[PDB]
Amino acid sequence: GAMAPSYRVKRMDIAKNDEECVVNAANPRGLPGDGVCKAVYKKWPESFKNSATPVGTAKTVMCGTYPVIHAVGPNFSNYTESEGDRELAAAYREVAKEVTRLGVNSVAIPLLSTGVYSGGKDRLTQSLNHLFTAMDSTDADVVIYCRDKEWEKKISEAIQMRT
Ligand SMILES: COc1ccc(C(=O)NCC(N)=O)cc1
Ligand SMILES: COc1ccc(C(=O)NCC(N)=O)cc1
Ligand SMILES: [Cl-]
Numbered sequence: 001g002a003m004a005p006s007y008r009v010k011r012m013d014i015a016k017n018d019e020e021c022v023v024n025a026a027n028p029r030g031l032p033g034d035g036v037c038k039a040v041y042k043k044w045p046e047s048f049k050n051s052a053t054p055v056g057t058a059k060t061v062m063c064g065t066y067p068v069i070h071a072v073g074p075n076f077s078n079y080t081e082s083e084g085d086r087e088l089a090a091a092y093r094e095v096a097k098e099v100t101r102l103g104v105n106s107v108a109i110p111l112l113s114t115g116v117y118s119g120g121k122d123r124l125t126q127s128l129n130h131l132f133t134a135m136d137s138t139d140a141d142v143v144i145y146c147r148d149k150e151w152e153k154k155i156s157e158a159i160q161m162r163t
Contacts, residue, residue, distance in 0.1 A: 001139030009159060011152040015044075019141070021107050023070075024069065025114075032048070055074050071092070071094065079119075091112050
């Protein structure tokens with residue numbers, strides 16, 4: 001584990017992370033996709049061998065020795081608010097289990113069920129709170145990667161608020 005487990009946020013490409021493993025904002029089918037998923041495919045294409053996994057789950061595939069944890073958040077276009085919220089919480093709980101199993105001291109993580117899986121709603125607070133609920137009991141350093149200036153500030157404030 002990290003000596004003093006922390007949360008940090010950066011606004012940059014998660015494919016250029018400085019952590020011991022990465023979480024992909026994957027689709028259920030292991031397709032290259034667009035956005036974060038496509039950046040992850042371009043950087044670690046070998047990690048998309050049998051990466052397909054259902055909504056609300058996480059499936060780790062090695063690229064060399066670098067673990068890619070494919071986490072499938074619900075697409076709120078398709079899910080009800082109630083069912084989508086349940087599946088989004090579940091995906092993050094599966095990420096925490098994989099991060100623990102891998103024995104890593106750090107993980108790069110994007111906010112799941114945002115952007116094209118958001119159903120046209122700002123889900124920063126909903127997604128980040130489910131991330132915290134799952135990761136708080138882990139001792140990995142967590143580095144959250146985002147792609148929005150207003151989000152970077154809010155995530156940073158939310159981290160600093162808990163101390
Ligand atoms: C390729 O990774 C990234 C990483 C971050 C961004 C981003 O912050 N866009 C919004 C802005 N430029 O205000 C875009 C792409
Ligand atoms: C009002 O609807 C939305 C819908 C989606 C977003 C969103 O996820 N932004 C961050 C990103 N990285 O794409 C923000 C607002
Ligand atoms: Cl997404």
